[PDB]
Amino acid sequence: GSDLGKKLLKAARAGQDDEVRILMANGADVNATDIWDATPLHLAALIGHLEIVEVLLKNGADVNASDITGTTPLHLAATMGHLEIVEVLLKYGADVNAYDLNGATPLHLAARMGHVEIVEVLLKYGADVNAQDKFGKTAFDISIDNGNEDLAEILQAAALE
């Protein structure tokens, strides 16, 4: 792809907030992809740099971009425990029930990592409590498997509604 796109992928991954803005002001492709079809938004959501996430989304980054594993930025933010980024992605229209090649939604991954607040934010945005991954596990099942009584209580109450 573009030479600036390669630089933007490296700068986003490196957490260089200033360089990301400089590269974009110079016309860098906000939707450039690496060999895994990951975008700068993927890498920014992964390392938890909110300011990079913001300037990418404000300048047209694909909030629902999937890499070849079926992973979206919301998957990575939920997995890594970046609460505000999960909120920012969701308000910019990220698919709350997107599933990867494991059939795992952000609710599954947030539950597996024990992020109660992220689960709550996902639930408020319409996460499917009953969604099963390709192994038949729901987010609630995962909470039981990890002995997370807080998540189990929240997920159980959400299912009754």
Binding site: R13, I35, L43, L46, T69, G70, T71, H75, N102
Partner: protein, 216 residues
Amino acid sequence: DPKFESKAALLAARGPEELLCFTERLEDLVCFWEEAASAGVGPGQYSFSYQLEDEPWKLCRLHQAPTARGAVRFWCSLPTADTSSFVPLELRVTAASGAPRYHRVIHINEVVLLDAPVGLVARLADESGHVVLRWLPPPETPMTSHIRYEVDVSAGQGAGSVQRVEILEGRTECVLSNLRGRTRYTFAVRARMAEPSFGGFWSAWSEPVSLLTPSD
């Protein structure tokens, strides 16, 4: 070899669901995770790939070993001595089917788990009633001038740990005061990188030494 299993288990306790990477002497790197055993899963069923700077993506052979708690531990060992420290290293673990397992970005030597200091010796100071502690840095470990230490002082009976002393960066000795006479004290020392960008984790305690203080 046994030390790695202790260190790996120590990190796994703080993050059971994570891909955990650490270095012991800043020249090698081990990344591992733990998961429940399954009838068909083995090292071949996962692909560990990594990209450093502008190098091509590379594959790392995965090893499988059991744990005391019955989880299966998968790990990869990458050389890092010639790599500049704190440069980004992107890591991916992918199932054979292409499904995601892990995706991380780490910085070289951002989680250092040193070996314990060695050669600890206690000595009655020339100033009566004081004890001087001296030790060697963790063996075969670079940047010894950037390692800080902590000294533990323990009594015999129920008193146990009576003192903890912080040793400034690069120092391999300290003088201990406020020790009770006619008392058998036990000393140990641990190490950590002082930056603290190297992680901020303490090593295991050194082999202990003991000493009987003089009267008065």
